[PDB]
């Protein structure tokens, strides 16, 4: 079940990669018996850095950015939301 985690931006960012769909909407899908519109997932986690230290794992799905639910959101829409924050990032991530 999803966990809420805080990543503190270092000089070189949050140290993880997001990958997902380019266009809005998409098929409803179930993770751990729970239904969602398509989510972006963490495609890479920089070892020993920021996101890693925060507990984010590769293949984690991103459910919320800073408390904003982002299911069904496009890739551009999500990465924008992350980069909005000055100092830090609060992620609601979901493992599989």
């Amino acid at each position: 079940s999803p966990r809420v985690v805080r990543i503190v931006k270092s000089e070189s960012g949050y140290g993880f990669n997001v990958r997902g769909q380019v266009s809005e909407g998409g098929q409803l899908r179930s993770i751990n018996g729970e239904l969602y519109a398509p989510l972006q997932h963490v495609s890479a986690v920089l070892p020993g850095g920021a996101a890693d230290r925060a507990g984010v794992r590769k293949g984690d799905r991103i459910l919320e950015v800073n408390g904003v639910n982002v299911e069904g959101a496009t890739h551009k829409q999500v990465v924008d939301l992350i980069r909005a924050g000055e100092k830090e990032l609060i992620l609601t991530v979901l493992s599989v």
């Binding site: 949050y14 990669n17 769909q21 380019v22």
Partner: peptide, 6 residues
């Protein structure tokens, strides 16, 4: 379909 480094 697309990736970003953040």
């Amino acid at each position: 379909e697309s990736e970003s480094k953040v």
